[PDB]
Design a protein around this ligand. Structure first.
Ligand SMILES: [Zn+2]
Lengths: 101, 50, 66, 97, 64
RNA sequence: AGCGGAGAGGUA
DNA sequence: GGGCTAATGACGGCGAATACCC
DNA sequence: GGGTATTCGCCGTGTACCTCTCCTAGCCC
């Protein structure tokens, strides 16, 4: 929701390239680009404000809704990075990861 | 803004409102207040501006 | 929480206790010289909140980037 | 009205529009052509990337103005990243070579 | 802006030369006689050329 | 608490 | 009232697709 | 075989600003 120490992370990307190439997409490229599949259409759960598991707005596929936090609250600190849970496996990374993958 | 003809100015210069000049050049005002030493932090300089 | 480095400088390291931010410059022995607090919700601007910390870690004897 | 620092959106890292909610004035499509007719690539790159669209340049230019140094960093905007992530969702491979 | 049209033939080369001159006065360089008007006066006074700018840039790179 | 899209009216 | 539960008042230009007299 | 003759479908139509309201909805207790 709110990040403070992430604002001063300067010089993170260079983006040095020469050309732009476009072609068709192989199915293996689509299977390697993604991080999981979806099976139940539900973008917002009702009577509680939590993302639906394996839905349109999911946490086990894309990432966490809150920065450096998980869904349940077992790992709620910045000292734990890259450690997923067991009942709701979310990578404890930055909030920028929800736009890339 | 709304344009208004002014005859007492040269063709290499133009007019500008004071509140617009304060709101546009506000980081330069903050840098000048930091360089002159009249305000320690940017919060005190912003409170002195407002 | 625990003290986490900014990784924009080599001298100072800060923390975050919710919606407020605090920093503390330190020498090679680990002794704190100055320590203040900043409110991000009171400012209402992200680059001004960046420049606040970047000036507080500049005027109070802060070592720049390597 | 006037503004220097305002709110940004979620899809593209751009300021809003209008006198309400602190929205900056839209740089038109023909204004970019009028700027490019003069040449002046330095005032066209600084008014398109480091002013509004970049998520790091918008802080770095403010830090350089408040501090006093003059060293800008050029990079790709976030809107091109949103466009290539939208094109990649159409089973069409597009990679920045 | 009118005197600088006679010392150089290209306007964009004049803009790039004044941009290379403006990166030195910000870090602190004693002037010849706002940094923009001072750099334009130093260009129009027929004192600052492409060799002296390279000399001060090499001295800054050696004294960095 | 910031961020969205439609319909109508008005100035240049 | 309530709480989850799922039209026909546009107009011009250009490229493919049968198809009809030759 | 064959070389156009209608015919169907796709493409598009200026810029910027100011103000107001209204949006997912519905159905048998
Ligand atoms: Zn969890």
């Amino acid at each position: 929701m709110k990040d403070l120490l992430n604002l001063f992370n300067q010089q993170r990307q260079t983006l040095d390239f020469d050309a732009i190439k476009i072609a068709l997409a192989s199915p293996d490229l689509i299977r390697s680009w993604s991080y999981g599949e979806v099976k139940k259409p539900e973008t917002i759960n009702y009577r509680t404000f939590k993302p639906e598991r394996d839905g349109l707005f999911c946490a086990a596929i894309f990432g966490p809704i809150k920065d450096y936090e998980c869904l349940c609250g077992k790992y709620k600190r910045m000292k734990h990075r890259g450690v997923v849970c067991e009942k709701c496996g979310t990578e404890v990374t930055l909030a920028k990861v929800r736009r890339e993958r | 803004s709304v344009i208004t003809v002014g005859p007492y100015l040269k063709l290499h210069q133009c007019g500008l409102p004071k509140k617009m000049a304060l709101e546009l050049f506000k980081p330069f005002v903050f840098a000048k207040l930091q360089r002159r030493g009249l305000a320690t932090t940017i919060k005190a300089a912003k409170k002195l501006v407002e | 929480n625990e003290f986490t480095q900014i990784s924009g400088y080599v001298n100072a390291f800060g923390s975050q206790r919710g919606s407020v931010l605090t920093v503390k410059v330190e020498n090679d022995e680990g002794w704190t010289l100055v320590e203040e607090d900043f409110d991000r919700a009171d400012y209402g601007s992200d680059p001004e909140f960046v420049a606040e910390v970047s000036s507080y870690l500049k005027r109070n004897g802060g070592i720049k980037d390597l | 009205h006037a503004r220097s620092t305002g709110p940004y959106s979620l899809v593209t890292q751009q300021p809003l529009g209008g006198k309400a909610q602190f929205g900056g004035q839209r740089f038109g499509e023909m204004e970019v052509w009028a700027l490019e007719a003069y040449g002046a690539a330095y005032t066209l790159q600084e008014m398109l990337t480091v002013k509004s669209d970049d998520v790091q340049g918008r802080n770095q230019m403010y830090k350089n103005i408040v501090d006093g140094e003059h060293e800008m960093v050029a990079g790709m905007p976030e809107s091109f990243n949103v466009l290539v992530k939208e094109i990649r969702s159409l089973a069409i491979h597009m990679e920045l070579e | 802006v009118e005197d600088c049209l006679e010392v150089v033939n290209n306007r964009f080369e004049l803009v790039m030369m004044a941009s290379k001159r403006a990166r030195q006065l910000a870090n602190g360089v004693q002037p010849l006689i706002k940094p923009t008007v001072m750099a334009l006066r130093e260009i129009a006074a027929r004192r600052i050329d492409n060799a002296l700018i390279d000399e001060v840039e090499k001295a800054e790179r050696e004294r960095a």
